[PDB]
Structure 1
Amino acid sequence: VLLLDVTPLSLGIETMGGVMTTLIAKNTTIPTKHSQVFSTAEDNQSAVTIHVLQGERKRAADNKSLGQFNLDGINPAPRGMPQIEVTFDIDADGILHVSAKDKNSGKEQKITIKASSGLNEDEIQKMVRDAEANAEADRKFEELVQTRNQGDHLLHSTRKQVEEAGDKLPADDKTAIESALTALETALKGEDKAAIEAKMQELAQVSQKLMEIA
């Protein structure tokens, strides 16, 4: 009332692309508890890595690591189907508890992080200045990661549809699409957004018939 325990920085986890996703926002009052359901990046994924982050930078690597931990025992499934509920709970005493539960398996790993873990009053002031200093670079990064994952999904999606299509697909139209997927997957290996979009553009244009079937 003359005083608040607040989170001086945001707390979250790394997600696909090397982006920090925020669970508890900067300048949140303690105690608190926020949960979010995540899934797998790839088919028959048997584990996820929960990499815990303190900071305001959109790039996982530019934020402060508080630890990591694995949740194994993910049963086979298509990617983006499993439910991994990640929850951050900070109690009154200043302790953070990150849990990851497979809502199928009922499996669960926790990690506990001392109130004293992370960046001292100084490193925090730098971190906030550096975030403002790089809202452009981080915008432009985020936009590319979005673009990549969109490309990635469109890649994996177009492969399923070709298998479930099979015989039903003109020889012609399959080749044209085998070429465009090979080109997209190569451009996803790069850092050039425009290049990714143009391979994505190429696939749309030559996929028209695969979509009807599908």
Structure 2
Amino acid sequence: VLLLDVTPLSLGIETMGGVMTTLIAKNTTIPTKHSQVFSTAEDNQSAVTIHVLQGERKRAADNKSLGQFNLDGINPAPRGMPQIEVTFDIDADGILHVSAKDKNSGKEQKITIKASSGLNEDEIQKMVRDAEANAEADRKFEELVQTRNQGDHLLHSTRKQVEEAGDKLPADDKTAIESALTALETALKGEDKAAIEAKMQELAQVSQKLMEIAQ
């Protein structure tokens, strides 16, 4: 064949730290379907947002948003343990069906995204060259996000511990911990990985008695 009907750009969803995770690659022939399992970003997360994206960039913010829906009712669990099955199906009419299903709760939500959605032909060529020009920056972004997500997890866990600790934790331990949480949050907004890891460190150093209490 000299002609093939294809989805012209990658389709996928936003995942923790502003990353696009691809479910269908660019140039895949239609009809097609694919599924992948995802989980929650934080302990006890009760809902997830499925932000559907078209584009070749690893930064979610630089891809074309197609729609979004939430899936609620995820039962309490440590982060990474729920199994949220995401399915993208493009039918022969170019209609995109996306669903998410929580295997423990049985709950499911879905959206339909019509065939004319997303980028037009001019924008598709633009998107491809932009991802090529930004290949190496996007590889560094993905590294930055791995570290930001670790930092985000520590911030969350430590804060839950502060709460649960109540008065068992001495007041000057709490003062130092709050300062170190703020400094870690500030660092998370930068693009320097070492800077983030250094604040995680400064936090852990003021956290030993709290680690003892929690334990």
TM-score range relative to shorter protein? 0.7 to 0.9
* Residue 46 (structure 1) shift: 1.8
Contact kept, 8 Å, 2:42 with 2:156, in 1: the verdict is: no
Residue 144 (structure 1) aligns with? 144
Normalized against structure 2, the TM-score is what? 0.80
Contact kept, 8 Å, 2:43 with 2:76, in 1: the verdict is: yes
* Residue 73 (structure 1) shift: 1.5
Contact kept, 8 Å, 2:11 with 2:53, in 1: the verdict is: yes
Unpaired stretches in structure 1, ≥5 consecutive residues: none
- Percent identity between the aligned chains? 100
* Residue 206 (structure 1) shift: 8.6
Q: Distance in 1 between matches of 2:213 and 2:33?
A: 46
Distance 1:178 1:118, change over 3 A: closer
The SS at the match of 1:98 is strand
Unpaired stretches in structure 2, ≥5 consecutive residues: none
* Residue 60 (structure 1) shift: 1.2
Q: Deviations over 1:50-79 (max 9, x none)?
A: 100001111111111111111111122222
* Residue 179 (structure 1) shift: 7.2
Structure 1 stretch displaced more, 93-102 or 75-84: 75-84
Residue 84 (structure 2) aligns with? 84
Distance 1:213 1:70, change over 3 A: closer
For the aligned residue pairs, the C-alpha RMSD in angstroms reads 3.2
Normalized against structure 1, the TM-score is what? 0.80
Q: Distance in 2 between matches of 1:69 and 1:168?
A: 41
Q: Distance in 2 between matches of 1:173 and 1:49?
A: 36
Q: Deviations over 1:157-182 (max 9, x none)?
A: 66789999999999999999887666
* Residue 154 (structure 1) shift: 4.4
Residue 182 (structure 1) aligns with? 182
Q: Distance in 2 between matches of 1:119 and 1:163?
A: 46
* Residue 150 (structure 1) shift: 2.3
The SS at the match of 2:82 is coil
Q: How many corresponding residue pairs?
A: 214
* Residue 192 (structure 1) shift: 3.0
Q: Distance in 2 between matches of 1:11 and 1:190?
A: 28
